[PDB]
Amino acid sequence: CIAHYGKCDGIINQCCDPWLCTPPIIGFCL
Prior knowledge:
Blueprint: no helix or strand
């Protein structure tokens, strides 16, 4: 479910950790 602080597919904010994927498109979950 997306690597730690790793980029996301974009429209899919399914980032387990650390918290959420923001921004959604072209961003990293922190």
